From Swiss-Prot, chain B:
It comes from the Eukaryota. Belongs to the ryanodine receptor (TC 1.A.3.1) family. RYR1 subfamily. The N-terminus is blocked. Residues 40-49 are annotated as: Interaction with FKBP1A. The gene is RYR1. It comes from Oryctolagus cuniculus (Rabbit). Binding of [3H]ryanodine indicates that the heterozygous channel is activated by Ca(2+) concentrations 4-fold lower than normal. Single-cell analysis of cotransfected cells shows a significantly increased resting cytoplasmic Ca(2+) level and a significantly reduced luminal Ca(2+) level. Detected in skeletal muscle (at protein level). Fast- or slow-twitch skeletal muscle. Homotetramer. Can also form heterotetramers with RYR2. Identified in a complex composed of RYR1, PDE4D, PKA, FKBP1A and protein phosphatase 1 (PP1). Repeated very high-level exercise decreases interaction with PDE4D and protein phosphatase 1 (PP1). Interacts with CALM; CALM with bound calcium inhibits the RYR1 channel activity. Interacts with S100A1. Interacts with FKBP1A; this stabilizes the closed conformation of the channel. Interacts with CACNA1S; interaction with CACNA1S is important for activation of the RYR1 channel. Interacts with CACNB1. This is Ryanodine receptor 1.
From Swiss-Prot, chain C:
Has the potential to contribute to the immunosuppressive and toxic effects of FK506 and rapamycin. PPIases accelerate the folding of proteins. It catalyzes the cis-trans isomerization of proline imidic peptide bonds in oligopeptides. SUPFAM superfamilies: FKBP-like. Its EC number is 5.2.1.8. Belongs to the FKBP-type PPIase family. FKBP1 subfamily. Pfam families: FKBP_C. The gene is FKBP1B. Residues 19-107 form the PPIase FKBP-type domain. The keyword Thylakoid does not apply. PANTHER family: PEPTIDYL-PROLYL CIS-TRANS ISOMERASE (PTHR10516), PEPTIDYL-PROLYL CIS-TRANS ISOMERASE FKBP1B (PTHR10516:SF429). This is Peptidyl-prolyl cis-trans isomerase FKBP1B.
Length: 783, 49, 107
């Protein structure tokens, strides 16, 4: 969308782009060379976290300016905005990284990388167990007092070791503190605060489910106090004397109790500060109410976690000393396999797989028909070895071998003459429980076998097909003398690899789908052509019930330019309005049906779909001083909910006017309030999102109304002036499939990232060009 | 009807490791600012812009 | 007529005069986004002289208003771009055309 700025020109050297992100009212604004750009994005979703990003091709050199010790800002930020360098987490260091890379360079070659774990916006909200429930156990009141007393003695000792001494008025420079007195000599409000805190340690133990009760009535009179030298004496005669708890040893459950008591206490304090209005920040700023440690305990520094943890440990050890006893689903696995043209049906073959990490990784042999959405070994199409825990997988799991360590190399050998598969670890042949030297036997030849591997989240592995025989590390040790050959010996180019891409795509419904059947009904005298969907396994055991995303195979395209019981022949021949309806059969809940249109760029596939999850954004344009003159609204899904129109079938009709971009809906002949407006060049696919609840689910009715043409007149050029409804074979129902196979590119762009300096910021550089020949499918607008 | 072919350039995205967001009771700030300075761009390294 | 949207500023002083040979690089695309022609693929600047009906009217009307080194978008209406007949096999009837034009040299 064109935008107006003083001196419009494409990005040229010496240009500085300032980006502002405001979340109080969702808005993104830009400034170029100090001049504002008259255009803003607004009213967008808030379902995730936002990060700065630059996209570029070969031939660029840019620098990130983040402020502070990093790239100094050339222009002053607008009031109230904070530099992005303040948002760095305590446990992480600033760096530049790619986005969801599945491949990287390594010392000896390419390293395959699995999915990366990402944080969520909910991970920054503190969630304490703190409930309104109060304990006030009368049997724990004495120990509350004794606990507070010992905590004070320990605190005073910690102060005195660090050079603090008594004085009636606190002085941080001279390290004078008035609390360096006997506990009983503290002011009443300070004593009461200490007793409250001791009581809340006890109440938090109880809220965590601990059983706290007297077990050794002799323990208290056997306690001794630590006897410090006179150098620990204050001028008022006070010398701390904490209990000698050297004999106390936390049990594992008690250690766990300390680890739980401190995290909850920190979270309660965090949420209290949030309620008081403070916010997390590296640059502590008391007047600005910004605190570096105002973050949940999951993400905290180890130094403070260990510090606060020790006070709570001593509290629990004090109690013991007194004799108390205290008692998505698909973006997870990434499958890499060789191309089908390398299928082997004979001979003996060898390859290696190095496990950089020790997590969930499987490696082995697979048939060409391997399915991308099934974990390796869950079916009969793969013979794999799971190295996280020594297991062999084929139509189930059985123990085999031992778990590997970091850097271990697994040598997979297949013998098609003896029909056997052998796995070796670090040159040593793996051994089963029954003494069988072969993992699998009597394997059928069939189509053949291909090397395959699967990686879980955060896993790194190196695959070596043996193109360079010298690169193999154990081939000579085990495999050479038995007649095995490298899988890719005598090959001019590296073997092309395919990976399972988790990008949802619409594909035709298989004719033999076990659960879903589509019947093409011919148009009778009183009924138009229909496409009825039926569930062929409803009610029986193992029936699959889940959200179904359906669409028609052909779109309707709006015109390039907009204007400023018997059909009338001139109106019907000059109209630009088209109609189609969907009949939801009786028995299917209307509350689980959404009917409308989808743009070709819909890839959501949400199992908890609602109209609130639909992506939306408003682009607002204005002049140099405001005066909004254009506010367009963009979305990829224009649908209505069937629950707004509530033993009888419901026939929801949809009307689109191609000459104005206006879309309207009808419910049982009654006009609905909802309507939509679209741009001239928009392509819309008829789509239905449904959760089945009956044998008969829906039925696309390709009919017509009075003086309104059917869909085939807009979908087919030869039928533009034909009012007779038609359902040609090309029009079919497609369902949204989650995962598909994709080919890995042979070469990747070389990007150089480095810190140019404190004031210059972080530099990105790319020079080498790369070009590929893309095949574009017109109707789907994808290549 | 017929499939179309053409030569296109590769494009790569780079992002810093800073994540911000908004949620009920969250401790994160709401307004953020950053700058990007362009030092060298070749208008036409290949036939495509 | 012809609309001009500048993409990169030119010298803004040297304009094409009568009789001069202009040498430009262009990419010609349809309004739907489909590319139909580009001199950069042939790696050869296109040369033409002004005022001798050697090209479609809109193209030379746009290039006449451009300065040395300028990069601009030219929009051409059907009434001037090949009219109703179009171009057999390449351009359909009543096609509004988009040209990315850079004025490289004159004479």
């Amino acid at each position: 969308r064109p935008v107006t700025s003083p001196g419009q020109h494409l990005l040229a050297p010496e240009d500085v782009v300032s980006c502002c992100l405001d979340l109080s009212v969702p808005s993104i604004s830009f400034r170029i060379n100090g001049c504002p750009v008259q255009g803003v994005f607004e009213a967008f979703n808030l379902d995730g976290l936002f990060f700065p990003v630059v996209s570029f091709s070969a031939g660029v050199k840019v620098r990130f300016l983040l402020g502070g010790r990093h790239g100094e800002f050339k222009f002053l930020p607008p009031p109230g905005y904070a530099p992005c360098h303040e948002a760095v987490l305590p446990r992480e260091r600033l760096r530049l990284e790619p986005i969801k890379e599945y491949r990287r360079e390594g010392p000896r070659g390419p390293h395959l990388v699995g999915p990366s774990r990402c944080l969520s916006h909910t991970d920054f909200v503190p969630c304490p167990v703190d409930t309104v429930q109060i304990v006030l156990p009368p049997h724990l009141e004495r120990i509350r007092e004794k606990l507070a007393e010992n905590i004070h003695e320990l605190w005073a000792l910690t102060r005195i070791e660090q050079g603090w001494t008594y004085g009636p008025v606190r002085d941080d420079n001279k390290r004078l503190h008035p609390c360096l007195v006997n506990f009983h000599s503290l002011p009443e409000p300070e004593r009461n605060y200490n007793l409250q805190m001791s009581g809340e340690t006890l109440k938090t133990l109880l809220a965590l489910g601990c059983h706290v009760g007297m077990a050794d009535e002799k323990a208290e009179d056997n306690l001794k106090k630590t006897k410090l030298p006179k150098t620990y004496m204050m001028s008022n005669g006070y010398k701390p004397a904490p209990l000698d708890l050297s004999h106390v040893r936390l049990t594992p459950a008690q250690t766990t109790l300390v680890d739980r008591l401190a995290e909850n206490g920190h979270n309660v304090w965090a949420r209290d500060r949030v309620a008081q209005g403070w916010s997390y920040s590296a640059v502590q700023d008391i007047p600005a109410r910004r605190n570096p440690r105002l973050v949940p305990y999951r993400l905290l520094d180890e130094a403070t976690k260990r510090s606060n943890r020790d006070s709570l440990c001593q509290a629990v050890r004090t109690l013991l000393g007194y004799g108390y006893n205290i008692e998505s689903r698909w973006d997870r696995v990434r499958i890499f396999r060789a191309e089908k043209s390398y299928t082997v049906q004979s001979g003996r073959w060898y390859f290696e797989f190095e496990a950089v990490t020790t997590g969930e990784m499987r490696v082995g042999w697979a048939r060409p028909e391997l399915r991308p959405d099934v974990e390796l070994g869950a079916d009969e199409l793969a013979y794999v070895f799971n190295g996280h825990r020594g297991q062999r997988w084929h139509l189930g799991s059985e123990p085999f071998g031992r778990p590997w360590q970091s850097g271990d190399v697994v040598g997979c050998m297949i013998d098609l003459t003896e029909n056997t598969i052998i796995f070796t670890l670090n040159g040593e042949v793996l051994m089963s429980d029954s003494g069988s030297e072969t993992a699998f036997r009597e394997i059928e030849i069939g189509d053949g076998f291909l090397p395959v591997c699967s990686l879980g989240p955060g896993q790194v592995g190196h695959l070596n097909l043996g193109q360079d025989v010298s690169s193999l590390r154990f081939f000579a040790i085990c495999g050479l003398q038995e007649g095995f050959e490298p899988f890719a010996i005598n090959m001019q180019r590296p073997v092309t690899t395919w990976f399972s891409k988790s990008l949802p795509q619409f594909e035709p419904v298989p004719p033999e789908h076990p659960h879903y059947e589509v019947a093409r009904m011919d148009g009778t005298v009183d009924t138009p052509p229909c496409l009825r969907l039926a569930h062929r396994t409803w009610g029986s055991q193992n029936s699959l019930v889940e959200m179904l995303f359906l669409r028609l195979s052909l779109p309707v395209q709006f015109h390039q330019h907009f204007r400023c019981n018997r059909d009338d022949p001139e109106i019907i021949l000059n109209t630009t309005t088209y109609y189609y309806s969907v009949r939801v059969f009786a028995g299917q809940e209307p509350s689980c049906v959404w009917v409308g249109w989808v743009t070709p760029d819909y890839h959501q596939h949400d199992m908890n779909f609602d109209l609130s999850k639909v992506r939306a954004v408003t682009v607002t344009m204005g002049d140099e001083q405001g005066n909004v003159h254009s506010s367009l609204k963009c979305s990829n899904c224009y649908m209505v909910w069937g629950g707004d129109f509530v033993h009888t079938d419901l026939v929801i009709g949809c009307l689109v006017d191609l000459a104005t971009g206006l879309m309207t809906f009808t419910a049982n002949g009654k006009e609905s309030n909802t309507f939509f407006q679209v741009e001239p060049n928009t392509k819309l696919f008829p789509a239905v999102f449904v959760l089945p609840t009956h044998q008969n689910v829906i039925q696309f009715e390709l009919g017509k109304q009075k003086n309104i043409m059917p869909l085939s007149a807009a979908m087919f050029l030869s039928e533009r002036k034909n009012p007779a409804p038609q359902c040609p074979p090309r029009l079919e129902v497609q369902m949204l499939m989650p995962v598909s196979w994709s080919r890995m590119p042979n070469h990747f762009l070389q990007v150089e990232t480095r810190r140019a300096g404190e004031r210059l910021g972080w530099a990105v550089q790319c020079q080498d060009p790369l070009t590929m020949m893309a095949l574009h499918i017109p109707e789907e607008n994808r290549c | 009807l017929l499939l179309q072919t053409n030569l296109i350039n590769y494009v790569t995205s780079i992002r810093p490791n800073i994540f911000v967001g908004r949620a009920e009771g969250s401790t994160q700030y709401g307004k953020w600012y950053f700058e990007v300075m362009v030092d060298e761009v070749v208008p036409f390294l290949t036939a495509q812009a | 007529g012809v609309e001009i949207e500048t993409i990169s500023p030119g010298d803004g002083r040297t304009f094409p005069k009568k009789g001069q040979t202009c040498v430009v690089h262009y990419t010609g695309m349809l309004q739907n986004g489909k590319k139909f022609d580009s001199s950069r693929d042939r790696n050869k600047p296109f040369k033409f002289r002004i005022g001798k009906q050697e090209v479609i009217k809109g193209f030379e009307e746009g290039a006449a208003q451009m300065s040395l080194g300028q990069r601009a978008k030219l929009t051409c209406t059907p009434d001037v771009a090949y009219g109703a007949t179009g171009h057999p096999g390449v351009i359909p009837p009543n096609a509004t055309l988009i040209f990315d034009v850079e004025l490289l040299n004159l004479e």
